[PDB]
RNA sequence: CAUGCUACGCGUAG
RNA sequence: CAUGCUACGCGUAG
RNA sequence: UGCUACGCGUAG
RNA sequence: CAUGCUACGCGUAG
């Protein structure tokens, strides 16, 4: 029957499901040459390739192989599969333990593989190792494709094997046995000294014991890396090796210094789970004065706060707790939403909210209790240490960087920095003394340049404050925003603002950040996505727990892609230290929730300068990963087009048989994707126009492929109920940015207009977030903006959708009448009253969508 | 319909409860928030009316806080 | 705009120009009347812009003070207004249980805790007078929130046990009203 | 505007024009003095414009120096506040154990997370439910981080004192969970 | 009068 | 000296 | 009481 | 606040 096979020859190359005298003599000779090795092979029904295929190409419909694997090795019982959402990670996390039952079975295999390699190294046999040729027990029964050479000089090709096995190591937690004394599940844990933070020798030992024959140089500390391609390679192994070490060793490295005679406690390094130990280079002891820059550096540093605070043990959450900066725990609650009775009565008088009507209120202000805010932080357990396919990742990072070749980036001075709003919070402990304007006016441009130069050589740990957002939603769950300190913003901006403004000012690209939907912009984007597609079909999906469950490797990759624009302004060490700062201030940071410090396991903070753009790069990377996984999962012998066959062959070559970047094939793959896979990505929202035939024959990415990639990378389960697929371009996308698309006729031209959900607009109009917004006579502009946003509803075939705009117009007119009456009662009528007329005419709202301006 | 104005009445009820310094009590405030969120995210008028009765009884529990006789008339 | 001193001059210049062009004068007359009306219009637009800026400043000040007054008036009268709106919408809802509990809180029958929706739970409520008692209570059946409850236990003010048989019009003066009655939902 | 040099020439030209118009001279001298007066008025307008401009930039510089003084004042205030807070948190930490753990380290650098684990005398534990209370903070004294902590105070979610006897299985629903227990090291 | 800026406010989006 | 056209500068209004 | 984008409004 | 346009007045040169 169908069995997993990783085949590679001149005809077919790929890892997919296949059906299944002199060569036999060669096999017997190779076996006789490798008979003494215990790792050489009974045989099991399933091999390693089958497990890798089941865990990386997971489908809710076909789980027979994975179920049989879990039941055969006593991982779980059959009735466990009767539980609903047993495969999901968000729902029923107990499956994380089930897969752990395979970890040892995987770990025990790795050693055998090494032994097998040793055997070849003892016989001088050059060959390639494949997953389909090693059973799940660990024995190797393959004795083909092995050429004889001088005994003692043979080299193995272990790229594809370990590469494809990387995700299974972190998914099954195979290295857990390394956390025990003498490596034994029955023996107790290893008691490491709390004063020990350098595990470099341990990482070298683990690498020499597990990945011994990996010919690429591995650096435990990312400070000694050649380029970003080496930083990512080192982080891929550091993520796996950090699981064994205790979590108390990681974090900022503190030390005692002397300032004018008094002992201070300052951070002089950082232990990243992915970058290793990073020591600051500008540490000056026995200082006699402290300036504004150093004052900010020490205030943002959590060393003093953690040393002054008392110990904390929080049982509500599973994340690590640092200390409690206050003697009393603070509980933050959300206030109930306000209700505008005037607009509600005006709408009810016009026949709205009647029984059986398709238009009803679905969005309100949801309140929360005191233990809800921290409960949101309790979601951060969805972030698990995930190891990614390193070669596939090094290819996808390049393919994604090719999407950002049209923009320009670099470092700008403080005089060129633009801040949207200055009267906003500056984080902890900077919010206790003033807003961001305070520190932006106190520090001159020279001080900001000095701080930037200091961050270019040293890393500063920061504290980010997570607070609840008071906004409209349709779910009872609350939303939290993590405001970072100003020391992080003034650096992230200075570093990435040129690229951020170049991306926002570019039109007609994949990333549609900065493109307005008014004045015919939506039509422009829609026609840009339809750029020459043979059989166009639209698709869209979502990312469950994106900001929470996204691994750290992809965030580091996105940061590297964003920093690759500094080829002439920043050096190697400067870029590495900027990446370390970004990881210490966004990736692995210190969260001050309820007056208590906690260690964030990972994920993307939502208060960073590179927030939307990081998510956009992540989306492009996931899309390219799905494309590569879909194209390489095909048989390759049933395709009638030679071009795609040779392209898949070269893809496999550049992935698992090549190490250097092949720019020619990168160009070819980028052109292929732009031709058969047009993308419109805005942060986490994505709309793809793909050739339907190529998706049917498995030449491009599909829904199941995105689901599998999210399963084995993002460690989340993407249900098909939330993903939409459209077969007719005339109707347009189903939903993009909470906006639906409709093809209308404007000036003898057929153009696409975006209309929102009437329920959201009516909820915004009826329920406000403050008391003055209810009946403060300032709501005129609010309702004008709501009508501007909801105008395209007047062309909907449903009359209930079109009546909302007329209701808003009449309400604006009534509000103007009441305002005029009140002004006449208090004093006299205004002279410029006629100017208000345009606000109750439909022409002012119709001109907002004309492509003239 | 009764669902819409029942949801609005529950919203105003929770607003008045929060204004009456009920949030000082963790258990009572959490129960009121749960009831209000269940009223908002509901599709049956009967359960919504029962939860509205519960929240109105919560409001009526405090006698000295609100003057029913003078305010209702 | 007739109140401005330059309005008379502008009107006179315009009338003179019209009468001169209607009479067919020489070209020098056309030039001098053009100059006159041009300087008159310059002065007129000067004064008009000045007056319009004055009135615009006044209008902005008036709308700003009106905004501030409305803001402070809404900040001041929030509690009473919100509670009146709440009770108005409550009366507009017109439900049996709602109106029943409103009347029971009006006459004096207010509960001690939340009216439970579970099939089996304890509901405790005070009764001040025997009139409301006989109106709401009937033996071991309690009509509350348009629902029937099985009367369980009764306590007086001094926390002494009293049976249902002792509650009567003859023994009401001997009772320490109000009475806290706890019951179970049927 | 008397301080302008061209203002005196313009005034003299206007006086000469008035004197000549009061005498009724020939048209030639009248138009000549008109042209001269117009030149003088143009120069007067130019010098008045540059005077308004220099006054405007003077006001702008005054506002700029006022803003700079405000910035310096706020910077001094922020520096004072930051230094005060830093010195307070410096005197707040415990040195007896910090110096010990620093001199015990050979490299001199230690992780941050171990600082409050081994050098803090007070421990605040937040317990959500009674099961976790019995599993962790059982009795008057408990063990955590290889240290014996004696319970000093227990507070509810409403910032109220809760006795040790009040924490029971039958009284768990009436308690305001979670409970924050502060215990000093012993 | 047009355009673009600056200041303040408001609305939507991720 | 008067009338007209062109280039330049200043002020005013839109 | 976060980051970014767009869009209105009122002043310079 | 700046730039440009339109209209008006003034002055210089052809
Ligand atoms: Zn490296
Ligand atoms: Zn640079």
């Amino acid at each position: 029957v169908y069995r997993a096979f990783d085949i590679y020859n001149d005809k077919v190359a790929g890892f997919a499901k296949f059906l299944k005298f002199s060569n036999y003599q060669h096999e017997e000779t190779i076996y006789n040459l490798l008979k003494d090795c215990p790792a050489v092979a009974r045989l099991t029904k399933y091999t390693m390739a089958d497990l890798v295929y089941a865990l990386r190409h997971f489908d809710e419909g076909n789980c027979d192989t994975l179920k049989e694997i879990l039941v055969t090795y006593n991982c779980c019982d059959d009735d466990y599969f009767n539980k609903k959402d047993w495969y999901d990670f968000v729902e029923n996390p107990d499956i994380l333990r089930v897969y752990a039952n395979l970890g040892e079975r995987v770990r025990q295999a790795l050693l055998k593989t090494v032994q097998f390699c040793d055997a070849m190294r003892n016989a001088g046999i050059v060959g390639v190792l494949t997953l389909d040729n090693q059973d799940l027990n660990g024995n190797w029964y393959d004795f083909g494709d092995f050429i004889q050479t001088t005994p003692g000089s043979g080299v193995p090709v272990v790229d594809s094997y370990y590469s494809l096995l990387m995700p299974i190591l972190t998914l099954t937690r195979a290295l857990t046995a390394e956390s025990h004394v003498d490596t034994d599940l029955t023996k107790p844990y290893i008691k490491w000294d709390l004063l020990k933070y350098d595990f470099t020798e341990e990482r070298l030992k683990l690498f020499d014991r597990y990945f011994k024959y990996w010919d690429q140089t591995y650096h435990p500390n990312c400070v000694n890396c050649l380029d970003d391609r080496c930083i990512l390679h080192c982080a891929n192994f550091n993520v796996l090796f950090s699981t064994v070490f205790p979590p108390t060793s990681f974090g900022p490295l503190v030390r005692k210094i002397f300032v004018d005679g008094v002992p201070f406690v300052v951070s002089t390094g950082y232990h990243f789970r992915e970058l290793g130990v990073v020591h600051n280079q500008d540490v000056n002891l026995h200082s006699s004065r402290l300036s504004f820059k150093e004052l900010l550096v020490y205030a943002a540093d959590p060393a003093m706060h953690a040393a002054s605070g008392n110990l904390l043990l929080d049982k509500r959450t599973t994340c690590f707790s640092v200390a409690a900066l206050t003697n009393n725990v603070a509980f933050q609650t959300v206030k109930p939403g306000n209700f505008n009775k005037d607009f509600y009565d005006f709408a009810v008088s016009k026949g709205f909210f009647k029984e059986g009507s398709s238009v009803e209120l679905k969005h309100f202000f949801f309140a929360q209790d005191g233990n809800a805010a921290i409960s949101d932080y309790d979601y951060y357990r969805y972030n698990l240490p995930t190891m990614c396919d390193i070669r596939q990742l090094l290819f996808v990072v390049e393919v994604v960087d090719k999407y950002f070749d049209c923009y320009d980036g670099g470092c700008i001075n403080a005089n060129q920095v633009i801040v949207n709003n200055l009267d906003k919070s500056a984080g902890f402990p900077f919010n206790k003394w003033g807003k961001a304007r305070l520190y932006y006016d106190s520090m001159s441009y020279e001080d900001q340049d000095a701080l930037f130069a200091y961050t270019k050589r040293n890393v500063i740990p920061t504290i980010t404050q997570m607070n609840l957002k008071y906004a409209i939603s349709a779910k009872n769950r609350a939303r939290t925003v993590a405001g970072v300190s100003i020391c992080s913003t003034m650096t992230n901006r200075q570093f990435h603002q040129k690229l951020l403004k170049s991306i926002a000012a570019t039109r007609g690209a994949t990333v549609v950040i900065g493109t307005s939907k008014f004045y015919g912009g939506w039509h422009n984007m829609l026609k840009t996505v339809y750029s020459d597609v043979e059989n166009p079909h639209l698709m869209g999906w979502d990312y469950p727990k994106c900001d929470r469950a996204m691994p750290n490797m992809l965030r580091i990759m996105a940061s590297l892609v964003l920093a690759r624009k500094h080829t002439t302004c920043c050096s190697l060490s400067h870029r590495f230290y900027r990446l370390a700062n970004e990881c210490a201030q966004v990736l692995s940071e210190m969260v001050m929730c309820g007056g208590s410090l906690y260690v964030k396991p990972g994920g993307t903070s939502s208060g960073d300068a590179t927030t939307a753009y990081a998510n956009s790069v992540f989306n492009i990377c996931q899309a390219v990963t799905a494309n590569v996984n879909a194209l390489l999962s095909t048989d390759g012998n049933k395709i009638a087009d030679k071009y795609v066959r040779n392209l898949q062959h070269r893809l496999y070559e550049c992935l698992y048989r090549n190490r250097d970047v092949d720019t020619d094939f990168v160009n070819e793959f980028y052109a292929y994707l732009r031709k058969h896979f047009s993308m419109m990505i805005l942060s986490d929202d994505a709309v793809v126009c793909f050739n339907s035939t190529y998706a049917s024959q498995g030449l491009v990415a599909s829904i199941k492929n995105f689901k599998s990639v999210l399963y084995y990378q993002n460690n989340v389960f993407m249900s098909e109920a939330k993903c939409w697929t459209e077969t007719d371009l005339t109707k347009g996308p189903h939903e993009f940015c909470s906006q639906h698309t409709m093809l209308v006729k404007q000036g003898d031209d057929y153009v696409y207009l975006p209309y929102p959900d009437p329920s959201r607009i009516l909820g915004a109009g009826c329920f406000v977030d403050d008391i003055v917004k209810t009946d403060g006579t300032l709501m005129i502009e609010r309702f004008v903006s709501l009508a501007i946003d909801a105008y395209p509803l007047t062309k909907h075939p449903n009359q209930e959708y079109a009546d909302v705009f007329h209701l808003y117009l009449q309400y604006i007119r009534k509000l103007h009448d009441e305002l005029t009456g009140h002004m006449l009662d208090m004093y006299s009528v205004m002279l410029t009253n006629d100017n208000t007329s345009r606000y109750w005419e439909p022409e002012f709202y119709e001109a907002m969508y004309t492509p003239h301006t | 319909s009764k669902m819409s104005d029942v949801k609005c009445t529950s919203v105003v009820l929770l607003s008045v409860l929060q204004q009456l310094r009920v949030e000082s009590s963790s258990k009572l405030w959490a129960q009121c928030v749960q009831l209000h969120n269940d009223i908002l995210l509901a599709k049956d008028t009967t359960e919504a009316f029962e939860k509205m009765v519960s929240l109105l009884s919560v409001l009526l529990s405090m006698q000295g806080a609100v003057d029913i006789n003078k305010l209702c008339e | 705009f007739s109140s401005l001193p330059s309005y008379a001059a502008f009107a006179t210049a315009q009338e003179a120009y019209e009468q001169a062009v209607a009479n067919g004068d020489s070209e020098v007359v056309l030039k001098k009347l053009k100059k006159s009306l041009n300087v008159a219009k310059s002065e007129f637009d000067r004064d008009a812009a000045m007056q319009r800026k004055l009135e615009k400043m006044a209008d902005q000040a008036m709308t700003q003070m009106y905004k501030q007054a409305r803001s402070e008036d809404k900040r001041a009268k929030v509690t009473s207004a919100m509670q009146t709106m709440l009770f108005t919408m409550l009366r507009k809802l017109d439900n049996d249980a709602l109106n029943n509990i409103i009347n029971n809180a009006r006459d004096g029958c207010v509960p001690l805790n939340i009216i439970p929706l579970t099939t089996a739970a304890k509901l405790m409520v005070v009764i001040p007078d025997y009139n409301t008692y006989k109106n709401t209570c009937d033996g071991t059946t309690f009509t509350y929130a348009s629902a029937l409850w099985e009367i369980q236990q009764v306590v007086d003010a001094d926390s002494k046990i009293v049976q249902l048989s002792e509650i009567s019009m003859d023994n009401s003066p001997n009772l320490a009203w109000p009475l806290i009655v706890t019951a179970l939902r049927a």
Side-chain angles (χ1 to χ4, degrees), chain A residues 771 775 777 822-823 830, chain C residues 59 66-67 70 74-75:
Chain A
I771 180 63
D775 282 7
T777 45
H822 292 166
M823 292 329 301
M830 43 194 166
Chain C
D59 187 339
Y66 168 74
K67 227 85 180 193
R70 182 64 68 252
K74 273 204 73 81
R75 283 183 220 287

Side-chain angles (χ1 to χ4, degrees), chain B residues 28 31-32 35 54-55 57-58 61, chain C residues 112-116 122-123:
Chain B
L28 210 55
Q31 273 182 348
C32 301
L35 283 182
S54 278
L55 211 63
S57 87
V58 172
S61 279
Chain C
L112 279 55
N113 45 287
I114 318 179
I115 303 190
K122 324 274 280 192
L123 171 53

